[PDB]
Amino acid sequence: ASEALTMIVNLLRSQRPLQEPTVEQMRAGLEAMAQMSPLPADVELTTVDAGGVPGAWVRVPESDPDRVVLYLHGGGYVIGSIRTHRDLAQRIARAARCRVLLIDYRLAPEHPHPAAVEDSTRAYRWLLETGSDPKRMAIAGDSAGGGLTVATLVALRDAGVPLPAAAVCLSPWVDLEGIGESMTTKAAVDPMVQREPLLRMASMYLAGQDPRTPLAAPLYADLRGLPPLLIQVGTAETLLDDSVRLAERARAAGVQVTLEPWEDMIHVWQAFAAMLPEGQQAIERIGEFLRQHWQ
């Protein structure tokens, strides 16, 4: 990997964003980190009420206005915001030449599961109601947002809602128990995600519900009929086996899956695309994948 990876690893080993002592310190910590990657002047941000869920349209000069990614941010279902993920949203908008709807879905512990999935499905139905066409849509998300992407597709399918052209999962979190082999074997090389913080956030999200609740932990969901899925994951991730197990389950359910393991990459390395070449390379791949499925 690029020497830039060492700089990102050094930042994450010091900032330890998922290890802050309170939820508000975790939220403020991630907002502080996001303020480092500042928004290009050509990004247009429009706040919107997306059918009862706060959102922001993210548009760049070459955004095809009829193509839309519903973007579901990461942060363990507990942290993250429009502010933390607007840079990743504009980079995807730029690579996919589309608009991105970034939603402020309800967060735990204040709003436990299934609030996040109610909000993501509501935003998708709102896009249809306001004239977006599924054949020009996609759902994408990182980490918890990658799990929420799969859960959103399952919930939409089960409600007879037409599914989008494709979906994208960046280092998805789909096993809320952390029982993947990589949760042990990659613990030493993962500078961001470990089992204890994972379980802390799963507890807040589940509020005593079965950790194998299918819309909370889509490793246990029925994935039949989902649209083509790109899963990007780093091999230096405790969550590597979340992506491997999701790919296995989705392919067993007849889903078109592209599993892309990026050698030595860390959790949601795409977020560091300003400084990390593999981050921008991976976002270009997201854009290529989406444009291919919108052809």
Crossing angle between the packed helical segments 82-96 and 23-34, to the nearest 10 degrees:
40
- CA distances to 39, 168, 173, 239 from 198, rounded to whole Å, are 29, 21, 9, 10
Gyration radius (Cα) of the chain, Å: 17
- HSE, side-chain direction, 13 A CA sphere, residue 263: 2
Q: Which residues contact 164 (CB under 8 A, 6 or more apart)?
A: 70, 124, 134, 137, 138, 139, 153, 227
Contact criterion met (CB below 8 Å) for 259 and 228: no
- Residue 32 CA to residue 245 CA, distance in Å, equals 33
Residue matched to tokens 């009829």: 66
- The structure tokens listed for 151 are 């859960």
**Distance between the two ends of the chain, CA-based, in angstroms?**
32
- Residue 153 CA to residue 21 CA, distance in Å, equals 34
- HSE, side-chain direction, 13 A CA sphere, residue 120: 32
- Residue 187 CA to residue 198 CA, distance in Å, equals 12
**Helix H or strand E segment including 226:** none
- Residue whose C-alpha is closest to residue 202's, from 187, 219, 188, 185: 219
Q: Are strands 54-59 and 98-103 parallel, antiparallel or unpaired?
A: antiparallel
Q: Which residues contact 42 (CB under 8 A, 6 or more apart)?
A: 60, 61
Resolution stated for this PDB structure, in Å: 1.6
- HSE, side-chain direction, 13 A CA sphere, residue 33: 22
Q: Which residues contact 289 (CB under 8 A, 6 or more apart)?
A: 166, 168, 230, 258
Active site residues: 143, 237, 267
- Residue 157 CA to residue 145 CA, distance in Å, equals 18
Q: What angle do CA 62, 67, 72 make, to 5 degrees?
A: 105
Contact criterion met (CB below 8 Å) for 147 and 173: yes
Contact criterion met (CB below 8 Å) for 59 and 46: yes
